[PDB]
Design a protein around this nucleic acid. Structure first.
Ligand SMILES: [Mg+2]
Ligand SMILES: [Mg+2]
Ligand SMILES: [Mg+2]
Ligand SMILES: [Mg+2]
Ligand SMILES: [Mg+2]
Ligand SMILES: [Mg+2]
Ligand SMILES: [Mg+2]
Ligand SMILES: [Mg+2]
Ligand SMILES: [Mg+2]
Ligand SMILES: [Mg+2]
Ligand SMILES: [Mg+2]
Ligand SMILES: [Mg+2]
Ligand SMILES: [Mg+2]
Ligand SMILES: [Mg+2]
Ligand SMILES: [Mg+2]
Ligand SMILES: [Mg+2]
Ligand SMILES: [Mg+2]
Ligand SMILES: [Mg+2]
Ligand SMILES: [Mg+2]
Ligand SMILES: [Mg+2]
Ligand SMILES: [Mg+2]
Ligand SMILES: [Mg+2]
Ligand SMILES: [Mg+2]
Ligand SMILES: [Mg+2]
Ligand SMILES: [Mg+2]
Ligand SMILES: [Mg+2]
Ligand SMILES: [Mg+2]
Ligand SMILES: [Mg+2]
Ligand SMILES: [Mg+2]
Ligand SMILES: [Mg+2]
Ligand SMILES: [Mg+2]
Ligand SMILES: [Mg+2]
Ligand SMILES: [Mg+2]
Ligand SMILES: [Mg+2]
Ligand SMILES: [Mg+2]
Ligand SMILES: [Mg+2]
Ligand SMILES: [Mg+2]
Ligand SMILES: [Mg+2]
Ligand SMILES: [Mg+2]
Ligand SMILES: [Mg+2]
Ligand SMILES: [Mg+2]
Ligand SMILES: [Mg+2]
Ligand SMILES: [Mg+2]
Ligand SMILES: [Mg+2]
Ligand SMILES: [Mg+2]
Ligand SMILES: [Mg+2]
Ligand SMILES: [Mg+2]
Ligand SMILES: [Mg+2]
Ligand SMILES: [Mg+2]
Ligand SMILES: [Mg+2]
Ligand SMILES: [Mg+2]
Ligand SMILES: [Mg+2]
Ligand SMILES: [Mg+2]
Ligand SMILES: [Mg+2]
Ligand SMILES: [Mg+2]
Ligand SMILES: [Mg+2]
Ligand SMILES: [Mg+2]
Ligand SMILES: [Mg+2]
Ligand SMILES: [Mg+2]
Ligand SMILES: [Mg+2]
Ligand SMILES: [Mg+2]
Ligand SMILES: [Mg+2]
Ligand SMILES: [Mg+2]
Ligand SMILES: [Mg+2]
Ligand SMILES: [Mg+2]
Ligand SMILES: [Mg+2]
Ligand SMILES: [Mg+2]
Ligand SMILES: [Mg+2]
Ligand SMILES: [Mg+2]
Ligand SMILES: [Mg+2]
Ligand SMILES: [Mg+2]
Ligand SMILES: [Mg+2]
Ligand SMILES: [Mg+2]
Ligand SMILES: [Mg+2]
Ligand SMILES: [Mg+2]
Ligand SMILES: [Mg+2]
Ligand SMILES: [Mg+2]
Ligand SMILES: [Mg+2]
Ligand SMILES: [Mg+2]
Ligand SMILES: [Mg+2]
Ligand SMILES: [Mg+2]
Ligand SMILES: [Mg+2]
Ligand SMILES: [Mg+2]
Ligand SMILES: [Mg+2]
Ligand SMILES: [Mg+2]
Ligand SMILES: [Mg+2]
Ligand SMILES: [Mg+2]
Ligand SMILES: [Mg+2]
Ligand SMILES: [Mg+2]
Ligand SMILES: [Mg+2]
Ligand SMILES: [Mg+2]
Ligand SMILES: [Mg+2]
Ligand SMILES: [Mg+2]
Ligand SMILES: [Mg+2]
Ligand SMILES: [Mg+2]
Ligand SMILES: [Mg+2]
Ligand SMILES: [Zn+2]
Lengths: 87, 126, 119, 70, 206, 50
RNA sequence: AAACUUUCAACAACGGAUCUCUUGGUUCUCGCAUCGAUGAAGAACGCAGCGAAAUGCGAUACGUAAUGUGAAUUGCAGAAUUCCGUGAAUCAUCGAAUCUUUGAACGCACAUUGCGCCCCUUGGUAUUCCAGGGGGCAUGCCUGUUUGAGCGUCAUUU
RNA sequence: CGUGGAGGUCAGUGACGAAGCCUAGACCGUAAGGUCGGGUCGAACGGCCUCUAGUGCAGAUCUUGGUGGUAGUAGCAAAUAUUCAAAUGAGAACUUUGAAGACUGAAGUGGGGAAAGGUUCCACGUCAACAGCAGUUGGACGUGGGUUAGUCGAUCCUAAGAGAUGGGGAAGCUCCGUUUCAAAGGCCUGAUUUUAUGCAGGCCACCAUCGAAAGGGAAUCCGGUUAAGAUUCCGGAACCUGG
RNA sequence: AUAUUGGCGAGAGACCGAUAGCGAACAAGUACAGUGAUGGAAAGAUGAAAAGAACUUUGAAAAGAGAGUGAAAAAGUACGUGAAAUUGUUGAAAGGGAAGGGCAUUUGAUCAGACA
């Protein structure tokens, strides 16, 4: 009975969706995400799990703000406006 | 040969820069030389094709033919001539795509800016 | 068409608020039509236009506040320079260039001389 | 459309962020009409539908082809 | 150096009717089950992966470096050798070929080529140019696209325009006596370059 | 189901919208290279794990 | 003698070797020093006339402002006034903005689009009830401000 | 002898056809192999002297991919059962309708729900794949439509339990404690007729919060209506809470 | 003065050449598996140009046969070349419980050379 008839009773989730990473790794009774670590202020990760790091580092998403720091740096963090010219 | 440290002979880097050039850059790669006539006339060898220019095909199968440029199809690195087309089996008609380096410019469409360009290259006008 | 910002910036505060309403009415009516017509690109330009009006309105109100804070300690955090978080807390040049009483006396009396070898 | 001819009701797609109060008033203001009550539901494509019933003074049909549709 | 090895694959051990290489575990994807790490596996690591700490340069005793370049210089006289080496010098008056010092002062390519022609290079210059071919390798797409012979080697005592006037002509190389390089003196380790010495250069030799 | 949280309905909605064939006009664009929709999903061939 | 089997060849299948390609990978080397409470990295959901991706963006949503260029964009439709011009563009540059719901994530919660409090303002006959608009309220710690506690403790009242 | 790549050279071959591939046609070598012809093909490639190695396969229950004999074979046999005719359609053992024969037998093969699914619901179109015969049918494919609440649930309460906070451990990630060795907080109105909310009484010391779609719990019913919703819409008639 | 398998920007190689090179040359950390931590692929090439096959004909259709385009369909969105295993047809041959091989010659088929 340990095989398939037991599998018939598999209809309750141990994890739902994680707010911080959206992964369906938020263990309900434990109230913590098995992937990202939420609600722990820090983010879960480990040096023995490189591929996982790779799967989640900076650059694997939008970079809504960091994107632009280097242009900005390149120009000395100029402020103001650009004037005019001709042609 | 190359002599500067900010220029690359690398073939890989070249082809990339070609094929992924932005529209603004393709404007200049799409340059046709002027006609022997126009070249004396303006003292200046080539210009980036613009639309309503008048042009002569001097290469390939349509060699000899002439017309007004109808679009610079920058996306395709190709220029269509309003007058040079494929008629079909179903008699529908279709632009042939031509390459600026295989044309010669025969009348320029002129702007303030076009003239400004020609001057900037140290050329002269009529 | 599409309204131009350099012409918006000459309207009064209150003119722009109404052109914004005018635009919004149009966009309302445009979407009503959109679902009768097979295509309706005109809508794009009316809704870029709304952007532009808002852009110009926020622009002017900002420019106002900016000035009436210009040249005092303490101005709203979003008119302060952004720079970088660290840059933001680096020592000011005055703070950095700060030199000890004892030290400037030294710098003064014995400063690195310019000299040369030959004769 | 039928609710509009038969029920004196105006069906609208409405901001998800908005409640029956905000739907009610805005229909009232954008359309010069009087609203009886406002039923709402979330569509299965993540948009909100408002079943707006006008009062008996108004005639949704008339009112709908003076916003422009039909 | 991480390549071949980015798996958590294990052997399945024996008794499963199947070889014993490690195998990608898990499932649902076609990669799982597959041979891992081994140098005979698709996507394995290679055998004895190449390492950057291989020895690339070589040290030759300075003295013996000189025996060779000296040797190489002496052969640029011996005209049989020069002939043997490619190099079209039946036309050329005598060997060593020594041209006037006025050469070092030539600013302009076309004049440099004219000079060269007048002293007998012509036929050798033409042999480059006639010999440009597409490299047969995969070389042709690692920045080695074309191939061609070597021309004459003009040696000066003082560059007063001569290196730039010759810089753009196919196959033609320059050198200042004071240096003087085995790679150029005996291209491909075959003796007998065709050298054109300026007088100034030729006497500094001693 | 049958009584869901709004978060789930939302996902549910987003996944209905994604469940459509490739828009055939894309097939015509210069350099276009997408043959068909290669991320299509079916309710009885792949469960969506919420 | 056929059929059958086997062998070879031609043509046709199956299959995707081989050869030639390469906007990728690898390794070397040179220059440089810039994430975040001024809300980062990451998540979710959305946004195009006609998109499911990838790429971009954020209800101002494949973009707004500015600036340089100087006439395209293109799969179709479109605008059409935008072409000797404050001016085309799925262009480049980018200094100004917008930036949903979230995240160290900060009013409390969160398998909830769940539940307070304070200020300004508008509507409902309203300081108190309801509703709309805007602005706010985490924690440790530093300097300072104000209001305080303790026979810890000084002096001073008559 | 043979292969990738490098220096030199033959001013080597080549779109008037490189390379590759095919060929019980030719020729050289004892051999590794080398050369030609013919067919096919379409953009590059070779000889010689040297340099260099990720350099030669039949096996490793070798790795990946492809292919066979087996073989039109095992099989497609549990759940009593099917039949006539019309209609439609290129096509009907299998679709639709009519007729007949049976079945489940209300401990249901009926009428609804919880978990779980997530659009499968409904309509129109429609057969390439899929439903181990079939297909005109479908939970398939294409395009659309559809889920209406003061009273139904959530939301509120507490249960086992979970878990912030003054604190105490721990190098630290963190662990312990939940009223615990803490200066832990808000209500009723009085006081105001500068004036809006400061102080004048007194109380209350209960010390977070999360945790039930079966526990506790304010209140709605009947008739009608849709392709597809209904204690939610329409009609009528109530009731609860707050103001 | 030193370090640097990260970040930004550059120049390179006696490096790999689509089963190789990073896992990923592509909508690749995707699709897919797993309650979870994690695991994690396959997959590039018509042609200069779509000129992507009008039109007729047989068919219910898919398609076939013509025609047409093209330097070529012996390039037809199954698309450059297109090996081998393995398959169909055609031609030839052999076969009394395997086949294949060695020396030798008959027979059939086939072919080089030398002669002048
Ligand atoms: Mg299982
Ligand atoms: Mg559990
Ligand atoms: Mg915990
Ligand atoms: Mg937290
Ligand atoms: Mg320059
Ligand atoms: Mg120019
Ligand atoms: Mg072209
Ligand atoms: Mg614009
Ligand atoms: Mg500051
Ligand atoms: Mg009516
Ligand atoms: Mg509702
Ligand atoms: Mg290793
Ligand atoms: Mg086995
Ligand atoms: Mg590998
Ligand atoms: Mg060569
Ligand atoms: Mg080769
Ligand atoms: Mg299932
Ligand atoms: Mg007989
Ligand atoms: Mg054979
Ligand atoms: Mg054959
Ligand atoms: Mg290859
Ligand atoms: Mg090519
Ligand atoms: Mg490289
Ligand atoms: Mg360098
Ligand atoms: Mg992270
Ligand atoms: Mg796009
Ligand atoms: Mg557009
Ligand atoms: Mg301007
Ligand atoms: Mg841009
Ligand atoms: Mg906004
Ligand atoms: Mg919180
Ligand atoms: Mg909220
Ligand atoms: Mg607010
Ligand atoms: Mg203090
Ligand atoms: Mg004090
Ligand atoms: Mg050898
Ligand atoms: Mg070799
Ligand atoms: Mg190699
Ligand atoms: Mg022969
Ligand atoms: Mg041939
Ligand atoms: Mg050939
Ligand atoms: Mg070719
Ligand atoms: Mg060798
Ligand atoms: Mg090897
Ligand atoms: Mg062997
Ligand atoms: Mg083998
Ligand atoms: Mg074997
Ligand atoms: Mg062996
Ligand atoms: Mg094998
Ligand atoms: Mg197999
Ligand atoms: Mg059969
Ligand atoms: Mg049988
Ligand atoms: Mg039976
Ligand atoms: Mg059986
Ligand atoms: Mg039957
Ligand atoms: Mg019975
Ligand atoms: Mg019974
Ligand atoms: Mg049944
Ligand atoms: Mg039901
Ligand atoms: Mg389901
Ligand atoms: Mg159905
Ligand atoms: Mg069929
Ligand atoms: Mg099925
Ligand atoms: Mg079947
Ligand atoms: Mg069938
Ligand atoms: Mg459907
Ligand atoms: Mg649908
Ligand atoms: Mg109730
Ligand atoms: Mg509630
Ligand atoms: Mg605790
Ligand atoms: Mg609770
Ligand atoms: Mg309950
Ligand atoms: Mg209950
Ligand atoms: Mg009823
Ligand atoms: Mg209805
Ligand atoms: Mg129903
Ligand atoms: Mg009612
Ligand atoms: Mg009543
Ligand atoms: Mg009452
Ligand atoms: Mg590096
Ligand atoms: Mg370098
Ligand atoms: Mg690979
Ligand atoms: Mg290799
Ligand atoms: Mg791989
Ligand atoms: Mg590629
Ligand atoms: Mg796949
Ligand atoms: Mg291919
Ligand atoms: Mg192509
Ligand atoms: Mg045909
Ligand atoms: Mg040809
Ligand atoms: Mg061919
Ligand atoms: Mg071909
Ligand atoms: Mg075709
Ligand atoms: Mg190809
Ligand atoms: Mg082929
Ligand atoms: Mg024999
Ligand atoms: Zn998480």
């Amino acid at each position: 009975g340990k095989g398939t008839p037991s599998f018939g009773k598999r209809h309750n989730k141990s994890h739902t969706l994680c707010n911080r990473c959206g992964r369906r790794s938020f263990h309900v009774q434990k109230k913590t995400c098995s992937s990202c670590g939420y609600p722990a202020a820090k983010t879960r990760s480990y040096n023995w799990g490189a591929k996982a790091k790779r799967r989640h580092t900076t650059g694997t998403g939008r970079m809504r703000y960091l994107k632009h720091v280097s242009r900005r740096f390149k120009n000395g963090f100029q402020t103001g406006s650009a004037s005019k010219a001709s042609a | 040969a190359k002599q500067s440290l900010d220029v690359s002979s690398d073939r890989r880097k070249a082809r990339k820069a070609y094929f992924t050039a932005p529209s603004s850059q393709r404007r200049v790669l799409l340059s046709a030389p002027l006609s022997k006539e126009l070249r004396a006339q303006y003292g200046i060898k080539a210009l980036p094709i613009r639309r309503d220019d008048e042009v002569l095909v001097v290469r390939g199968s349509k060699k000899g033919q002439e017309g007004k440029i109808s679009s610079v199809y920058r996306l395709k690195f190709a220029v269509q001539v309003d007058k040079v087309t494929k008629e079909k089996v179903n008699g529908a008609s279709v632009p042939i795509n031509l390459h600026p380096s295989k044309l010669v410019i025969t009348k320029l469409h002129l702007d303030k800016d076009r003239k400004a360009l020609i001057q900037r290259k140290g050329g002269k006008l009529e | 068409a599409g309204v131009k910002a350099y012409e918006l910036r000459t309207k009064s505060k209150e003119q722009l608020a109404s052109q914004l309403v005018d635009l919004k009415k149009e966009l309302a009516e445009l979407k009503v039509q959109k679902l009768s017509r097979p295509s309706l690109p005109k809508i794009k330009t009316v809704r870029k236009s709304i952007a532009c009006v808002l852009t110009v309105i926020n622009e002017q109100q900002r420019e106002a506040v900016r000035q009436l804070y210009k040249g005092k300690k303490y101005q709203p955090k979003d008119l302060r320079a952004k720079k970088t978080r660290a840059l933001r807390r680096a020592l000011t040049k005055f703070e950095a260039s700060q030199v000890t009483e004892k030290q400037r006396k030294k710098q003064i009396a014995f400063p690195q001389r310019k000299y040369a070898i030959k004769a | 459309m039928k609710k509009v001819e038969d029920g004196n009701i105006l069906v609208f797609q409405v901001s998800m962020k908005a409640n029956k109060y905000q739907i009610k008033k805005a229909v009232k203001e954008l359309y010069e009409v009087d609203v009886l009550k406002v039923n709402t539901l979330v569509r299965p494509n993540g948009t909100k539908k408002a079943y707006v019933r006008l009062t008996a003074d108004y005639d949704a049909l008339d009112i709908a082809n003076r916003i422009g549709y039909i | 150096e991480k390549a071949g090895h980015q798996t958590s694959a294990e052997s399945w051990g024996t008794g499963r009717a199947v070889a014993r290489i490690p195998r990608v575990g898990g499932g649902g994807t076609g990669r799982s089950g597959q041979g891992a790490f081994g140098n005979m596996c698709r996507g394995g690591r290679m055998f004895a992966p190449t390492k950057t700490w291989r020895k690339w340069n070589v040290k030759v005793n300075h003295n013996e470096k000189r025996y060779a370049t000296a040797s190489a210089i002496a052969a640029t006289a011996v005209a049989s050798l020069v002939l043997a080496r490619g190099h079209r010098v039946e036309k050329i008056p005598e060997i060593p070929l020594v041209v006037s010092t006025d050469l070092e002062s030539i600013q302009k390519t076309k004049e440099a080529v004219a000079a060269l022609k007048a002293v007998g290079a012509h036929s050798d210059l033409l042999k480059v140019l006639k010999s440009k071919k597409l490299r047969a390798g995969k070389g042709k797409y690692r920045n080695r696209r074309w191939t061609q012979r070597r021309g004459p080697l003009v040696v000066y005592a003082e560059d007063n325009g001569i290196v730039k006037a010759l810089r753009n002509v196919p196959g033609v190389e320059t050198a200042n006596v004071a240096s003087l390089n085995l790679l150029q003196l005996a291209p491909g380790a075959h003796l007998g370059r065709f050298v054109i010495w300026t007088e100034a250069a030729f006497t500094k030799l001693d | 189901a049958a009584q869901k949280s709004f978060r789930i309905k939302q996902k549910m909605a987003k996944a209905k919208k994604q469940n459509r064939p490739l828009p055939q006009w894309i097939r015509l664009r210069t350099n276009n290279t997408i043959r068909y929709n290669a991320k299509r999903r079916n309710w009885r061939r792949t469960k969506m794990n919420i």
